[PDB]
A paper describes a structure:
Both human NMT isozymes, NMT1 and NMT2, are expressed in most tissues and have been implicated in the development and progression of diseases including cancer, epilepsy, Alzheimer’s disease, Noonan-like syndrome and viral and bacterial infections. N-myristoylation is necessarily preceded by proteolysis to reveal an N-terminal glycine, the only completely conserved motif across all known NMT substrates.
Comparison of the first crystal structure of NMT2 with that of NMT1 reveals a highly conserved active site, consistent with similar kinetic parameters in simple recombinant enzyme assays.
Residue numbers in the entry: 109 to 496
Write the structure that this text describes.
């Protein structure tokens, strides 16, 4: 509530990362690669065990789903919780280069109840002039009952171990809370697509005084998209999408570098997981693409609705079409698919449209972090990486 004090990074102090608020003017690995690496798993509190989850096993996925449905990311006010679908999880956790030893679970020794999880997946990552093989870390989760018993540092050490085994010594990760040390701090913005449901669910916030009718009328969108050539992406586009994305991403201080197998993984439309629309220039050649992913949230304690449907801006590449025109079509497309809210961070060039497409700013930050790499902290606008 009010209770301002000062934190000691019991776990994070010990780790290869910069001290919170050291001034960094250098570029490089905080420590060199471990040429000899620990081969035995870290010790768990008694009653608990390591499991490598096989998500191909329908019952295991279902357990993982239920763990996260019930114990994953919640907002400040705790009226909302991420409801990552089982298939969304299959998409996010099994890109090209994925290894199963990187799907790390914690289970109750006796009744086998899944109570912990952390995941890693491979990616080539460009920090300023250095493109490094890293992993992206996601889905850290400890069961509500098990909170505050130092289990999160066990999973983090353990995943640090199984990744190090494989010759990776750098990683990237985001979190909504401050740790040592943010490269950058982004802010979520939200765009009402359906302001009535947003109001009844209490997600917004009618700006007193404002009628409902006037709100609905402000966020009014057309029913049909504007850009000539605009259509879903199909397999034949894979090659041109790659080229377009690796070129566009050059301008940003942080960005992945993707091959084609990765391009097909991340961008080919999958219903209720990922949408990608390409702009085909008047002949046949591709000049732009917008994309966005599907992530509903559980509305906790409410009578009317139990789920809020959100679109997350992913990567939007513009060469011919202006960006604000692309994003206007992204909004229209999301609206017409029954989403209630379009969400975007203020990274890349997104600041160039947020205010103009009537996004409003939202609570809390998203910090971006690197593991075992020092570099100065750049602005949101210079961040060209997006994680699920
Ligand atoms: C080269 C490969 C490298 C691989 C790994 C690289 C790094 C990967 C790092 C992972 C990146 C994940 C990316 C990602 O998944 C995206 S951010 C999503 C994180 N998950 C959630 O918010 C789920 C809801 N919360 C929880 O489940 C728990 O509260 C968690 C699991 C967060 C901690 O459960 P707990 O019961 O509340 O905590 P204790 O067991 O008592 O442990 C407390 C220690 O945990 C530190 N902590 C708290 N939140 C953290 C966070 N979000 N990152 C890192 N550390 C975090 C905390 O500062 C303290 O350390 P300190 O004493 O030093 O201050
Ligand atoms: Mg704990």
């Amino acid at each position: 509530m009010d209770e301002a004090a000062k934190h000691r990074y019991q776990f994070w102090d010990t780790q290869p990362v910069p001290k919170l608020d050291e001034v960094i003017t250098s570029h490089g690995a905080i420590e060199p690669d471990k040429d000899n690496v620990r081969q035995e798993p870290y010790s768990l509190p008694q009653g608990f065990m390591w499991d490598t989850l096989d998500l191909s096993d329908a019952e295991v996925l279902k357990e993982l789903y239920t763990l996260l449905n019930e114990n994953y990311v919640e907002d400040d006010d705790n009226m909302f919780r991420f409801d990552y679908s089982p298939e969304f999880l299959l998409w996010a956790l099994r890109p090209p280069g994925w290894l199963l030893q990187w799907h790390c679970g914690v289970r109750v020794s006796s009744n086998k109840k899944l109570v912990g999880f952390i995941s890693a997946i491979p990616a080539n990552i460009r920090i300023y002039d250095s493109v490094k093989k890293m992993v992206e870390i996601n889905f850290l989760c400890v069961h509500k009952k098990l909170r505050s018993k130092r289990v999160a540092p066990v999973l983090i050490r353990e995943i640090t171990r199984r990744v190090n085994l494989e010759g990776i010594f750098q990683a990237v990760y985001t979190a909504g809370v401050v740790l040592p040390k943010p490269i950058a701090t982004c802010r979520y913005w939200h765009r009402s697509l359906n302001p009535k449901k947003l109001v009844e669910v209490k997600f917004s916030h009618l700006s007193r005084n404002m009628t409902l009718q006037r709100t609905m009328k402000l966020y009014r969108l057309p029913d049909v998209t504007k850009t000539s050539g605009l259509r879903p992406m199909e397999p034949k586009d894979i090659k041109s999408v790659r080229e377009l994305i690796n070129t566009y991403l050059k301008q940003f201080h942080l960005a992945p570098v993707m091959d084609e197998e990765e391009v097909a993984h991340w961008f080919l439309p999958r219903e209720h997981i990922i949408d990608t629309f390409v702009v085909e220039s008047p002949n046949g050649k591709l000049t732009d693409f917008l994309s966005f992913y599907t992530l509903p949230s559980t509305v906790m304690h409410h009578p009317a609705h139990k789920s809020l449907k959100a679109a997350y801006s992913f990567y939007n590449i513009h060469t011919e079409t202006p960006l604000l025109d692309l994003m206007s079509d992204a909004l229209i497309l999301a609206k017409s698919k029954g989403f209630d809210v379009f969400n975007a961070l203020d990274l890349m060039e997104n600041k160039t449209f947020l205010e103009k497409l009537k996004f409003g700013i939202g609570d809390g930050n998203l910090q971006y972090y690197l593991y075992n790499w020092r570099c100065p902290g750049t602005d949101s606008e210079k961040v060209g990486l997006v994680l699920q």
